[PDB]
């Protein structure tokens, strides 16, 4: 009698944030089971929680870890009401560094939280969603989805990896019921070292990290938002109608983005955000 | 003197024909290295060399498992020239079917050859490419990587994750002179007991609907090959080749709607 709710990646951030928005909704329509890698690590969700007043029953933790089909599906088993009606695939990493100096195993994990993670949980849980005729998705996007970053080589792959992945699926999803989206962030709030890292590189490539380095500081300071104002946007592509594909949580790089798009052999793009950085 | 190739998968298709385009045009001036998971699967790169009246020493062949990384080491130690000139990281893999039809291990196999091993590539060989401050590098790509497709959905996933790995890379190396293209190809010539079934339906559906495409659209390698050749003989070469018209409509759709949903409502009726 109420909108079931499952969120990756809640013990802090954006899932934190919304799962206490949600639990927390005047209108208690939402039962949210907001799920974490670890839920020793469970106490700020609870804090925010208790604080916000979110009616008891209106909130449950679930341990599930990306990495790992059981656990993904042993959350699966977890839900009570036997249905999902939103499902929200936000866990996820970062991976900075000059290709070079990073590591093939930190490569992998990237690629296993971020792509693969988000596969076992659609693999998990469409098929009752396809099965029953509804559902929406909810994707944790990023900009680094969107369009290619210095130094963020490989997580810009992860990115670009679920836009695809998202992409396809929505294609297919269509006359199913299922409606997959995008929730695209630029910097949010509430956000290895030199010594080592000369030694993986050459020194033009090391001098040109810190100029990065020097320039995402200055970004952060200028354009990261709460992850509250963030959450509200999840919140919207969930209430809509028709839900489109993708919200951006911001227009502010709107433009770097329709110069990637009013040019394919991708020349400007790679001009313009090279003078933006460096 | 001569241009140093290294190619990945030449044992057939697009590294095959291009392998054998530059052992063998007439200007004799490009050397190739032309790689293969292994050499068991040799005899049609040598065939089709042979075919062609390739000098020798304009091809030696190695083993390189873009999977492993010691092998990539391995097939570096074999420039006898000691710097490569153009590097092209063409192995790829497809992986076709619904979504919950798949495969653990395949799954993450496609993304650690497609995206992991191109990682690799790049690790072991553009460090002495920035330190020259010269070199080629050449991805093959696809129309997968560009836009969204039914049923594979986890292929585009790894296309479109080395559009954004290129893209990034792009940007850090412009002034070291040293260029990273993508020559994007269109199509170049158990389920059930996984799957419910109206899924299973329509992946014939869609099935049905590339085989028609193949049909009016596909390119043979040699067509390709040629891209290729255009795009390593720019002066001033851009990050994407695009092997052929015919996508670029329901891509500029694609892009006219960052949103999203036209290009899955085009789609969509397209396909269905
Ligand atoms: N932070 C920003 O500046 C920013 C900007 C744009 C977009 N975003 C996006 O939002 C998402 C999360 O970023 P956030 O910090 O804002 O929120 P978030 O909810 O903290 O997401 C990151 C989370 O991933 C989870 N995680 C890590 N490994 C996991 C695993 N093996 N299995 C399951 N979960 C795992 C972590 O907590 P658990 O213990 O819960 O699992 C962590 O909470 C990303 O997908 C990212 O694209 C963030
Ligand atoms: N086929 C099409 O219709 C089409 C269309 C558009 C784009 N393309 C693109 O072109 C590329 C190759 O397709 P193709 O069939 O036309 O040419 P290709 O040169 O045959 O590339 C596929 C190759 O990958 C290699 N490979 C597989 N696993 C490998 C591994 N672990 N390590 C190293 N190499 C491995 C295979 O031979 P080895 O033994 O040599 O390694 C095989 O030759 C892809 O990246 C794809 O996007 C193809
Ligand atoms: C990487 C960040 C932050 C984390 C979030 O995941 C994505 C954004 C994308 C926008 C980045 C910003 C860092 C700095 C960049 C590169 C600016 O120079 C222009 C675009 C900015
Ligand atoms: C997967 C392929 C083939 C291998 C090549 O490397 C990439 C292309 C992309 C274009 C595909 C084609 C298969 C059929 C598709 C999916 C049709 O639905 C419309 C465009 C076609």
């Not at 866990?91 to 560094?97: F, S």
């Not at 998705?137 to 080589?153: A, C, E, I, Q, Y």
């Not at 992850?227 to 227009?251: G, H, N």
């Amino acid at each position: 009698a109420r909108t079931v709710v499952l969120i990756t990646g809640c013990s802090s951030g954006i899932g934190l944030h919304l799962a206490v928005r949600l639990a927390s909704d005047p209108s208690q329509s939402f039962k949210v089971y907001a799920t974490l890698r670890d839920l020793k690590t469970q106490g700020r969700l609870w804090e925010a929680a208790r604080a916000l007043a979110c009616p008891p029953g209106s909130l449950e933790t679930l341990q599930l870890d990306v990495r790992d089909s059981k656990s993904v599906a042993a959350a699966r088993e977890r839900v009570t009401e036997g249905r999902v009606d939103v499902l929200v695939c936000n866990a996820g990493l970062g991976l900075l560094g000059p290709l070079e100096a990073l590591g093939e195993d930190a490569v992998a994990s990237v690629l296993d939280v971020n792509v693969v993670g988000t596969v076992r949980m659609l693999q998990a849980f469409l098929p009752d969603m396809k099965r029953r005729g509804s559902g929406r998705v909810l994707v944790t996007g990023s900009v680094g989805g969107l369009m290619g970053l210095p130094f963020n080589d490989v997580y810009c792959a992860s990115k670009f990896a679920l836009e695809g992945l998202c992409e396809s699926l929505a294609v297919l999803l269509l006359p199913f019921g299922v409606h997959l989206s995008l929730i695209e962030c630029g910097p949010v709030h509430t956000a290895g070292s030199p010594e080592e890292v000369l030694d993986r590189t050459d020194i033009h490539t090391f001098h040109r990290f810190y100029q990065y380095l020097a320039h995402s500081k200055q970004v952060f300071r200028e354009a990261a938002q709460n992850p509250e104002e963030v959450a509200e946007v999840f919140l919207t592509a969930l209430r809509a109608p028709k839900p489109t594909l993708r919200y951006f949580t911001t227009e502010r790089f709107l433009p770097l983005l329709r110069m990637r798009l009013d040019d394919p052999s991708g020349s400007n793009y790679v001009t313009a955000m090279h003078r933006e950085v460096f």
